[PDB]
Design an enzyme around this catalytic site. Sequence first.
Site, mmCIF file in Angstrom:
data_model
loop_
_atom_site.group_PDB
_atom_site.id
_atom_site.type_symbol
_atom_site.label_atom_id
_atom_site.label_comp_id
_atom_site.label_asym_id
_atom_site.label_seq_id
_atom_site.Cartn_x
_atom_site.Cartn_y
_atom_site.Cartn_z
ATOM 1 N N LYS A 178 0.887 -1.100 0.073
ATOM 2 C CA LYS A 178 -0.309 -0.169 0.015
ATOM 3 C C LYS A 178 0.963 1.174 0.056
ATOM 4 C CE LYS A 178 -2.030 3.258 2.738
ATOM 5 N NZ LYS A 178 -2.282 2.576 4.282
ATOM 6 N N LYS A 197 0.401 5.662 0.139
ATOM 7 C CA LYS A 197 -0.508 6.737 0.200
ATOM 8 C C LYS A 197 -0.185 7.782 -1.082
ATOM 9 C CE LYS A 197 -1.063 6.268 5.086
ATOM 10 N NZ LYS A 197 -2.681 6.104 5.100
ATOM 11 N N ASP A 225 -4.079 4.925 -1.189
ATOM 12 C CA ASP A 225 -4.961 5.536 -0.191
ATOM 13 C C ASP A 225 -4.692 7.055 -0.122
ATOM 14 O OD1 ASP A 225 -5.889 6.381 2.318
ATOM 15 O OD2 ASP A 225 -4.580 4.988 3.333
ATOM 16 N N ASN A 254 -6.280 9.418 2.187
ATOM 17 C CA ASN A 254 -6.545 9.685 3.210
ATOM 18 C C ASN A 254 -7.328 11.138 3.395
ATOM 19 O OD1 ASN A 254 -3.500 8.544 3.928
ATOM 20 N ND2 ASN A 254 -4.959 8.419 5.555
ATOM 21 N N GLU A 311 -8.744 3.849 -1.378
ATOM 22 C CA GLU A 311 -9.200 3.774 0.039
ATOM 23 C C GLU A 311 -9.089 5.210 0.422
ATOM 24 O OE1 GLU A 311 -6.850 2.733 4.360
ATOM 25 O OE2 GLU A 311 -6.046 1.862 2.381
ATOM 26 N N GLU A 367 -10.943 2.461 8.573
ATOM 27 C CA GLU A 367 -10.172 2.710 9.596
ATOM 28 C C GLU A 367 -10.704 3.843 10.391
ATOM 29 O OE1 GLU A 367 -6.999 4.280 6.743
ATOM 30 O OE2 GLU A 367 -6.280 5.369 8.144
ATOM 31 N N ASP A 418 -10.506 -0.844 12.100
ATOM 32 C CA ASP A 418 -9.344 -0.541 12.905
ATOM 33 C C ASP A 418 -9.655 -1.289 14.327
ATOM 34 O OD1 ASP A 418 -8.186 1.257 15.305
ATOM 35 O OD2 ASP A 418 -6.941 1.605 13.473
ATOM 36 N N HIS A 450 -6.977 -2.699 9.909
ATOM 37 C CA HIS A 450 -6.098 -1.606 9.929
ATOM 38 C C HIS A 450 -5.506 -1.421 11.130
ATOM 39 C CE1 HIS A 450 -5.628 3.003 10.823
ATOM 40 N NE2 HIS A 450 -5.047 2.805 9.488
ATOM 41 N N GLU A 457 -3.226 -5.606 7.427
ATOM 42 C CA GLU A 457 -2.262 -4.482 7.041
ATOM 43 C C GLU A 457 -0.942 -4.711 7.925
ATOM 44 O OE1 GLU A 457 -3.474 -0.553 8.717
ATOM 45 O OE2 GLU A 457 -2.025 0.468 7.211
HETATM 46 B B1 LIG Z 1 -2.988 5.543 6.496
HETATM 47 O O1 LIG Z 1 -4.309 5.602 6.654
HETATM 48 O O2 LIG Z 1 -2.539 4.167 6.616
HETATM 49 C C1 LIG Z 1 -1.822 3.803 7.564
HETATM 50 O O3 LIG Z 1 -2.140 2.787 8.366
HETATM 51 C C2 LIG Z 1 -1.756 5.203 8.380
HETATM 52 C C3 LIG Z 1 -2.272 5.937 7.857
HETATM 53 C C4 LIG Z 1 -2.458 7.415 8.477
HETATM 54 C C5 LIG Z 1 -1.920 7.669 9.518
HETATM 55 C C6 LIG Z 1 -0.954 6.716 10.358
HETATM 56 C C7 LIG Z 1 -1.255 5.425 9.903
HETATM 57 MG MG LIG Z 2 -5.734 4.371 5.178
#
Ligand SMILES: *[B@@]1([O])O[C]([O])C2=C1[C]=[C][C]=[C]2
Ligand SMILES: [Mg+2]
Lengths: 357, 358, 357, 357
Positions: A162, A164, A193, A195, A219, A245, A268, A295, A315
């Site tokens: 994964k 980001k 991802d 976020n 994600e 999460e 999570d 998560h 994860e």
């Molecule tokens: B992200 O969403 O994936 C990880 O698990 C993580 C993230 C953000 C902040 C901390 C860890």
């Molecule tokens: Mg994430």
Amino acid sequence: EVLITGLRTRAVNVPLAYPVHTAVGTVGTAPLVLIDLATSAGVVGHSYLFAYTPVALKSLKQLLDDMAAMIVNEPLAPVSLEAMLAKRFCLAGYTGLIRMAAAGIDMAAWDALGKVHETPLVKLLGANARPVQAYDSHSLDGVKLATERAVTAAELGFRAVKTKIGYPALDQDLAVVRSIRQAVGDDFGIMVDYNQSLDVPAAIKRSQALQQEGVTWIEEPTLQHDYEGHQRIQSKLNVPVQMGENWLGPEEMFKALSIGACRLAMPDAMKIGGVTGWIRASALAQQFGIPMSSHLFQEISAHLLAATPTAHWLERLDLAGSVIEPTLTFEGGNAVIPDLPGVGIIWREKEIGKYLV
Amino acid sequence: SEVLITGLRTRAVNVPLAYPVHTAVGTVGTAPLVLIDLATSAGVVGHSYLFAYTPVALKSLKQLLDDMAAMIVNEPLAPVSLEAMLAKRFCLAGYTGLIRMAAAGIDMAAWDALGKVHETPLVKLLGANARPVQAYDSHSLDGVKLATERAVTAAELGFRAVKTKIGYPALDQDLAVVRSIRQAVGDDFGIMVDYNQSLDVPAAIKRSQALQQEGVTWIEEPTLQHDYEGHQRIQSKLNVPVQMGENWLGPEEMFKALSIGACRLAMPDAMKIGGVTGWIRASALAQQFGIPMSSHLFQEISAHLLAATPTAHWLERLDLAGSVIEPTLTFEGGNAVIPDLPGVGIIWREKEIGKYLV
Amino acid sequence: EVLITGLRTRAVNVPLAYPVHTAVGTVGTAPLVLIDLATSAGVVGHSYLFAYTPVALKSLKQLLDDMAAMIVNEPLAPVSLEAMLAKRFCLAGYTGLIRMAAAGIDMAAWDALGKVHETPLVKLLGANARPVQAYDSHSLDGVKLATERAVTAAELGFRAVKTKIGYPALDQDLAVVRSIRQAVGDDFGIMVDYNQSLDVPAAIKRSQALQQEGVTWIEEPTLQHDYEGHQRIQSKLNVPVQMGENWLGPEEMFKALSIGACRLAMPDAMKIGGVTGWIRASALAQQFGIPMSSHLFQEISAHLLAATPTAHWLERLDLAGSVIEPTLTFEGGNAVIPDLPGVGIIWREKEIGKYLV
Amino acid sequence: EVLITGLRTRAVNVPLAYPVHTAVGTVGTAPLVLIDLATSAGVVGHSYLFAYTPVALKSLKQLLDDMAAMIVNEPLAPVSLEAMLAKRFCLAGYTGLIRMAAAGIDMAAWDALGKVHETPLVKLLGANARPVQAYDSHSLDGVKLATERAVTAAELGFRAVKTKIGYPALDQDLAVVRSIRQAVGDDFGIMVDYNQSLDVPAAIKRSQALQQEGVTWIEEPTLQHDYEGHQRIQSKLNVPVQMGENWLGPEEMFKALSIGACRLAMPDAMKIGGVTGWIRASALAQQFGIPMSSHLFQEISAHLLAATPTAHWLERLDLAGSVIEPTLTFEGGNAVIPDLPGVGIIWREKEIGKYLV
Ligand SMILES: *[B@@]1([O])O[C]([O])C2=C1[C]=[C][C]=[C]2
Ligand SMILES: [Mg+2]
Ligand SMILES: *[B@@]1([O])O[C]([O])C2=C1[C]=[C][C]=[C]2
Ligand SMILES: *[B@@]1([O])O[C]([O])C2=C1[C]=[C][C]=[C]2
Ligand SMILES: *[B@@]1([O])O[C]([O])C2=C1[C]=[C][C]=[C]2
Ligand SMILES: [Mg+2]
Ligand SMILES: [Mg+2]
Ligand SMILES: [Mg+2]
């Protein structure tokens, strides 16, 4: 029979081998609350919480410490404990930090309960231990580091990574995925991802380009509480939208799944409500037809996924490896539950004092 | 000239209540509050306070606020931009619960300070005329005798409605309380009732249909606060309006509840809804969904906020902070009257606060 | 404390450097009503209204002048004033010209309130001033002029332009977009505006063809009140449908968003109800997850977008530049709010006489 | 080919024997615009508009006078003229005063066209004249006057009356209905009208009390544009909810009927868009199964209802009797269409002069 006799918390700020860069800022260290739950049977339950930012770390410790009188001298019955906390906090708001604190107690109480019965948590839940496929969880690393880390993960035996994304330009997202893909090949997972960093139109445009590139899931493309917006995004995609999460309790997951926000879920262990919340989440994922991943909290998630009918991925992001012994192992990219009672967490007591807040 | 935030001071107090707030799910015997002082480069100081509900969360809430100070000190006194920043900064940890309440307390102090910067009451800064707003005297799960005494006393004080909290073991006890109040106050008088989430959906249908025959004014949080679907099912069986909203954390939770039809009335909490900034957005929603909008606690700022609310309904008079705040808010004929003071009108009782410090 | 003491209006018909050609006819001049709201504090609030056609100009001025007695000697409290007008016109119909007139009073009253407090409107609303990205707004100009204007806007720093389409043939639509695209390159926005000129099937056909070319949004494909039809069109597109300049009040925005008519919104400061209506519109767009842009009224929209959680683009169409001092400036394509109290509008009192009706 | 050769308008403020008190304020006089449409056939079409408040009167006349240039020298084809106005006003907003003005032209054009063919309007629409039951329309008159007028209505032959309610207390609403009911008896209609003055919970409360008393319909309980809210109120009642006088065009009627806002409809010949809009509204009420009444404009509504498949009641409120000859008669409470070409409107020229504005 077995009563809770004490609660001790320790707030640590542990450095990470790689900062977790995200589209919304960097988590450069891991603020953790380490929990010990003492019992009248001689065993001590272990769990930990992740506070995401140092700004919440001391607040979460203080809250747990003020909760100790609510649970000391109660039976070690996590499901009954959870319902008591749910009611005691129903005016203040059984969510956020409070729910997170309640989950930390739950995860330690289940650890204690498996120890009482001298049995791994997965077996106390009625399931056989089994390996789970794990993906190596990376961050917003830039093309150079993203590709190096994906190569190292593949060398360690992981079958998926994964990264980001959510760089200023869509072309930068695609450059990172393309570079990872050339280095790991076609038969390899690349989960991406955002976020929560895109609005719905941006997420449709970016996600359709990623889908043409070939990714494994997309994600949290937009605000995590905007279940309708995720449904609209998912309606324009063949690739599955992944979220979960940030669900606080199974009731938030029920809302998201009821309106079709996502074709995958990844609760999570902390935010969903600990083991008790996970079990309920797993019953919803099954009935809604949702493959369910984890998560963070990889130590306990190995046990929980083994009892999850629609278990998907674990994860692998070892937030607490600096303060927990590496009894969880990875063979062929699969997490392997240790042959230990309860969760299998053993504090590295020499290292904890290094990181106390 | 630009105005900057130059300090944040918090004081945790555990304050006496003349009458403990008994509820169906437990008793709030004292008021755990966090008092907020927002100093500024204009010299004026913004005041607000938060309600922690239980002493268990009090010290944690103060600690969170003190650790949040670094995010806001030396920022412009622009509450809408400050709120956007806190929303982004806390999007991973969870912009809800204690964190969100902490952010609202900052927001309410910042808007107070902005009214003081402009030497004008908050209502006028929001673009609205001050107007009196009808207020109900808010009581608790007092038992028949005390419930009736307090309702007579509120009627003598000029209030035209009271709220009682119900959810006794038997429906006949709920009814006995509501009926006793009705006999002591008469037919031209509101009786709002509050279950504090204590019933399941079928029990709420049964009890509410019995209360509806008595003509109560609304039925408040019959079941679990997050269960918007269930509230809709209860409301579907009633002519009497279902009331909720004191537990919505942010207008996004309000939007979800109203979208599914959970309630025909709304009562946001100035803290949990997100402060003045969140209240303004909540009022915009209530207007479009056709929902009369009341307040929950925080009567000092809610008098201002309701005067700016197109569907303003009732003000909850529950004077949780009266032991530490000067009585500049007055009630004439049961109506809250906004004081002619800049910002919200909060003046600390500095000699009283030290008696209650945690 | 502060009362409204008077209302003066002036109807002008102002020349446009470029006629606004649309699919449904040409707006060759700007019929405006210029509004002065006098107060007991010495300050004067300014706003203006756009009448779209000279046929409605004198009517709108007359209506405002007959509204004077309703507001003179009322407090300068725009939110309570709007409520009063809403009630007083609830039988005649609080929409249309009457609503536009009410919005004109609202925008001038908010300008006056900012002047009472000696602060820019954005700061009175509780927000920091921030620059807002702007697109240069063109019209149904034909291939040659459309490309020239797009080149010139790119030279002035704009990162996007809008062109109005709806030529008799779809090939003519595509020929304009293709020509603009070759001159500005791929890293550049091209918004296209049909001005309600297509039925739903024609709009599905044309819009899918424009989508394949690559455009930034497709605005008002069909009848502005047909929210269901816009939903049908949007259901067949990845590109976002844009609408909102014709919503009379946030209640009409609420209806369109509730049925999913569009993935973008662009309320018009006048027709949405002025500042008070804008604030309500922005609360809706936030909860529905809609990026929100402005339509005309660039002077006031720069303030309003800075207080809008989902602020997207500012439309740069300087309808009133010949009568208003250019205190609003553009730097790198972003509108920059002037450091002036209230909205920042200063009449060019020598120019106004040239255009009086 | 008959062409329009002129358009003349006269603004009058005419006396009302009884002021129309409502829950939202008093209409003490009737501000009307009288319309003369001259033609190349020599006949002149007559109609009139109701401006609701003197504040809108001069503005509406001014708008009509400036619209005259769009219609003079066009053929006398009302349906084609309406389509032209709809297009020409599609940017400004084809609603509100502009739509009302367009309706006034439409109603004069249809009266003109009837005169060209020397035939009453109902017969030109393809229907037989038939008597239509009428209710005598009263206002917020208090117990004493409401009952006196109801007695007088019954003696004139009407079999139903409407009173306007929304007094401060529900007990006052009910005291009026109860006194009227005693005076008229059980076999008699009492329609009640709130003129938008309740929120949705108040409307549910008052309406269920009125339903227990026994009323014929409950009219506009809440904000006229809140179709969802009307549906919610209607969902709690056996008595029908009635609305429609504020629909601007059949497209607004379609939206309200589509969501089930009301079980009865009463379009207003002006706001619905004239004869042309009425015919379309009639086609919608038929398919949605809605009995359809009129609002105001009793002279033309008598013809239109005769052509309406679900015709219900005619509102007898004679706003224009001071300036129009009483060719419409009432037999047994039924409106009787006069044997005259077109609508049957003959100005009282010696009376109009007293009331000119
Ligand atoms: B992200 O969403 O994936 C990880 O698990 C993580 C993230 C953000 C902040 C901390 C860890
Ligand atoms: Mg994430
Ligand atoms: B109840 O919901 O009404 C009061 O505002 C109150 C309640 C519970 C706890 C404290 C105050
Ligand atoms: B069009 O919709 O975009 C411009 O703002 C404009 C339009 C039509 C008429 C005038 C201006
Ligand atoms: B009311 O709605 O009924 C009458 O037709 C009337 C109303 C209001 C204003 C004028 C006339
Ligand atoms: Mg309550
Ligand atoms: Mg446009
Ligand atoms: Mg009516």
